[PDB]
Amino acid sequence: AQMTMVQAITDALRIELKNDPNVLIFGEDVGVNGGVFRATEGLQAEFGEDRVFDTPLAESGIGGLAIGLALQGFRPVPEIQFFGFVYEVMDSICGQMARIRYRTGGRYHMPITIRSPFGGGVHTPELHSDSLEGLVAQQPGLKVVIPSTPYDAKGLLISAIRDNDPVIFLEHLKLYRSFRQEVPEGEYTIPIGKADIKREGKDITIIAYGAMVHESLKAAAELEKEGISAEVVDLRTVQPLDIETIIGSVEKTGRAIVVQEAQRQAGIAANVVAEINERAILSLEAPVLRVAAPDTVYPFAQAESVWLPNFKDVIETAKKVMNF
Amino acid sequence: AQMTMVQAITDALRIELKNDPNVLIFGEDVGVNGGVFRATEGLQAEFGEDRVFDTPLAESGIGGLAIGLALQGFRPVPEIQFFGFVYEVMDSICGQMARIRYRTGGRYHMPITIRSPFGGGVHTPELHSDSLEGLVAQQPGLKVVIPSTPYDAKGLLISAIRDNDPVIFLEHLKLYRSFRQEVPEGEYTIPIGKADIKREGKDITIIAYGAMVHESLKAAAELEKEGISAEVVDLRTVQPLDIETIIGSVEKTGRAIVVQEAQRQAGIAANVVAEINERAILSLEAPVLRVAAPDTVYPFAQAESVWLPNFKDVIETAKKVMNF
Amino acid sequence: TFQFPFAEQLEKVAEQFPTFQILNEEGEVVNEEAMPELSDEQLKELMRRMVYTRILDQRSISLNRQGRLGFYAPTAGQEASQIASHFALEKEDFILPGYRDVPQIIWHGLPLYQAFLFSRGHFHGNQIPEGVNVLPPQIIIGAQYIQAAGVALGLKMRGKKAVAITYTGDGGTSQGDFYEGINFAGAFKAPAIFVVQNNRFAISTPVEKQTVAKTLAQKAVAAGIPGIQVDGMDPLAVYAAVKAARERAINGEGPTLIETLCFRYGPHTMSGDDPTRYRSKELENEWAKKDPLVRFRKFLEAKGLWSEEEENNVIEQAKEEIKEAIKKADETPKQKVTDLISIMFEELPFNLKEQYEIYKEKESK
Amino acid sequence: TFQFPFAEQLEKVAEQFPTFQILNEEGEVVNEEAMPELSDEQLKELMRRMVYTRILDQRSISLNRQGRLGFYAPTAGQEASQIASHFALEKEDFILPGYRDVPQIIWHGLPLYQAFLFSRGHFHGNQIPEGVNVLPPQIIIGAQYIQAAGVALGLKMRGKKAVAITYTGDGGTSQGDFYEGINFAGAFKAPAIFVVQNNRFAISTPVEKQTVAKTLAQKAVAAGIPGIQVDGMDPLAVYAAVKAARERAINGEGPTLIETLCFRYGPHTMSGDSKELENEWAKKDPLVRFRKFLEAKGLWSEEEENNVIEQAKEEIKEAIKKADETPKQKVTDLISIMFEELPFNLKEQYEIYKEKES
Amino acid sequence: RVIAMPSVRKYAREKGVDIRLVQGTGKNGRVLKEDIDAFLAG
């Protein structure tokens, strides 16, 4: 069916609740209310309060609760209401659940999926739209997934939940219901750690994730009229990186840019650039440049349009690389 | 005087306490006890409990206290006992003090210096030795300083305390008393954001920080036995990077490696590689490679010697770059 | 097996936190001994500010629905809690608001148009006038509590006879930072007033799901500080509680926690919350009769201190000032990326120096 | 001006948390009503375990000074609080220890040699035997409390008649996670036992500097759960409190907070650091009064005590030998335990270190 | 395909040399700056 990304996410959660009695969803307002963005709408009504439930208002406690529940054989899918609140629960995520398999030498493990919305363009209050994927990307023991489409979101979320180690699943607020896409009914999985080619090209590799994939595809449409063929690579997973797909593309084009919504000093672009320069510098016609936000705090809401990277910045930087 | 790094830190703290009555030092066991590593010994005795004091055992509360004291005109120098405990206080650091000048359009500011030890090689318990500098390096509005010598520690700590925005001052456990160095008495400063050349060279640039500066100097002396001349650059500040110094070096040598104690997926090495690729790719005779720890959780203490990067790894990777 | 008196314990402790009330729903004085010393003009002013704030709520919701405001957390129903608590403060006192506590910092001296720029998302809305002792509304629930401990300590260290006051909600009481803030303030015997506005819901979540504590005021016991539960729909009770907390604080006796029992008539915020999903109309109507404006009006009328003309005057005053403020917000120049870079640091680091030049060039057009 | 009765409030809440005691320092029963039902053999085993644990602490300190152990947090003085609380548990109960709570998880089934490997810093030390319900000692103070609420809720959802028990110190109670853990467990009516061991010091920090709370037991009030302050040098008081808490939990009534008043005769750890205040608490030694109590009942003797001591010394000797003989860690070991399925970066690095180790 | 460091590729262009023609004297066929100069000088 033609689904929005939020509908695709709900469908994944419903399917996992149905097929795995150990799956639990919990967090602030996910129960009766069905989530502040309706991502868990109807789940409690269908599957019960023992399985989908509200918690007290405390992110750290939500993290601890998930770790505990996992020690008791459950498959926790907690929600953090906005990923800007990850600062309250960083120890449970990075200090604890990322490390428990290692800490116990495989005696215990954490089949936990943390869902959290992020991303700009919808004029949220402070610390609602921040891109903090760069932080959890640096913690061994986690995987970090960021979909750009309904089809990807459902298949990656199901993979995430079935994965027996901690996965951070980040949902871009701008993409929740701004477009529809055909999504298969029933269960399907998409491999975690696997990028995909959103647009085949010959002249330059544009690597992106989240809302920036759309900005990159928009840019590639305009670059074509200019006689520049851009290959658009959606990372889908930002930790770990799909090195093979990235390098495969860069070796064909000999030119690349990396596009993120995060500040230049944040995000995962520097890691991608470092990996490309390490493995494929004998194919590079030019430096791999980054499209990123300015190194300030996330913008006051009215300043989003002038601060957030967009397709015009992707075009400008692409042509910079083309003309190097 | 000949001083260890911990002695230089204490001397810097004493100087700032005397020079500026708004300076306050506080945290767990910093008062009466003089700190876990004696970094604040005798400071409360000299300046009193009003200036140097113990707090309850709660990192988040210490962060909050520093912020509120800064709002009341003080120049707080809080301590986090080990930087693996940063996870407890990430919101005060990254969600709050880093953002306050921006958040208030310059109406308030945070003249705060957070001191915290980190780093391996001394067989500490879990979450004591982790390198988490990569996390705070990604937050706009913070500066992150990591000295490798007594002379640098005293000069950088005075600058940090005097700086009117938040500075994270990270003190390597292994370097606290690893050696003595001539250090001027009385006050002097060293600019934040300025690297320096610890060893002049012409064939390869080795970029390092923390305990890896000594490992790189050790590698350079061995490389010279074979007529390979390495220029060793100590970052001193990991955020912001001294681009001009790093680039000046790489343009001269045409080859580079970056050395960090942190896991490959962590630290700041990827940022350095990305900045070098961007600004000096035309000077590279070889790719910029990284020396870093395996992407596992920090090692169980007895596994430190097989896991931590050391001079032998620096030599190996340097040669890889020479023979590329 | 031997039985500990666990039931007695819960009973006897919660018995130390009975609901403090001065004015009942009909505006009768039911606690004459506790009546705060307020002049006829102070009483009128308190009523004017509560009416003004109710209009500000109504207009703010209307402006938000028109797209003229952004983030907005409605305040109607909490006027006694927010306005009578502020009324007990002095200029030198420092306020650390949550995201719903905009009316407190407006009355403490933040211009109305800056409050509107805060809603829209503009750095100038947070550029608090010098000497006005407030922070912008805190989005991270509980962060304001640990910061308040530090402000209070700082006031104490300079020997100022002033307090730090901070506000959070029932939801906020579940946060580690809530607990660490009150404990830090107790440990340092610092002049902090902690207010918990219990409006019965944390977004969609009923307060009974936060905690099994019978009262929120008793959470004070964990920090070893006094706690008071008050009728948060009673301006005189709220005032007297905060005034007593202030007196304790400035005379060096440390902090107090105050829990007000109030209600928010409107949604959590204007960004999609819908109360029909989690509460009944019968509950809303029940708390509609407890409206602080209703009893305080009856109380004032019986003393001859309030009239419909005076009330209509305040209302018309609020509407005109609100109309000027939204205009002044609109006339604020648009933010530039170079602006946001410049307020990042006193002295810009290399990366920001570089990016400054780049956006300066971009902005020269 | 109108005065609120805050002095009364503080005093009335205090009255609700009087120190629970069954055995005084002379081993005389002072609370016959609350005496727990224990067989003669159980009382003897309780003493054996406390004696054994005291010897374990002495040997662990000596072995640390020899370099034969690494990280060690001394336990001498806390045997009632640690061993008598554990004695009230069943095998199905789940322990979440702090970093000082090694004795509890040993008695619950962690082999002694693995406890030694935990100290030394070896992943095998943390490979808990299957079916033994414990986590390795928690270094992040308070983290174990929020995890305990989740374990307790897990037990509840599966209908198990078991509890999660967790331990922290007085310093621990100032942490946000301390409060969040008890409150979450309270909110879900979860079968959790929270134990606060008040040994008067958080490293160098006196308990008086943690909080102006006059007891730590009363912090339960903030979560709306019962609290008990207990004589932490009294094995029978400790046992009785945890037993009562367990009964309450397993019958669906939710958690309890227990504060034990104890002491550690040794340093904070062996990493870095009044004589009369140490001597004061030396007279309250749980071993002293329990020895007197058992000896007046004809249930204890010098010979039995000497036997347990030699048994402890022999078992410690063999455990340290067994730690010495466990093979050294390789980087490929550490990589292999990071995930179920290695991600691409760890796959590459596994091959690099496999080749280095060859 | 050609295997060449970016500096070499850029040098080729600045002097209008098609790099896909040049035979590299570097390791594994890598074209070097001196090969661009040996292609220009005959």
Ligand SMILES: Cc1ncc(C[n+]2csc(CCOP(=O)(O)OP(=O)(O)O)c2C)c(N)n1
């Ligand atoms: C640390 C943190 N976690 C979660 C949120 C999400 N959130 C925003 S407003 C809100 C409701 C808070 O309820 P309460 O503390 O009772 O205050 P009220 O909004 O009712 O005034 C929540 C959960 C937040 N702003 N900060």
Ligand SMILES: Cc1ncc(C[n+]2csc(CCOP(=O)(O)OP(=O)(O)O)c2C)c(N)n1
């Ligand atoms: C989150 C965290 N912060 C700080 C520390 C440092 N630290 C370790 S042990 C200790 C003191 C112990 O305090 P307490 O909770 O009373 O436990 P005890 O060691 O007395 O058993 C401190 C401050 C830690 N381990 N974890």
Ligand SMILES: [K+]
């Ligand atoms: K998972």
Ligand SMILES: [K+]
């Ligand atoms: K500073």
Ligand SMILES: [Mg+2]
């Ligand atoms: Mg916390």
Ligand SMILES: [Mg+2]
């Ligand atoms: Mg509320």
Ligand SMILES: [Mg+2]
């Ligand atoms: Mg202690």
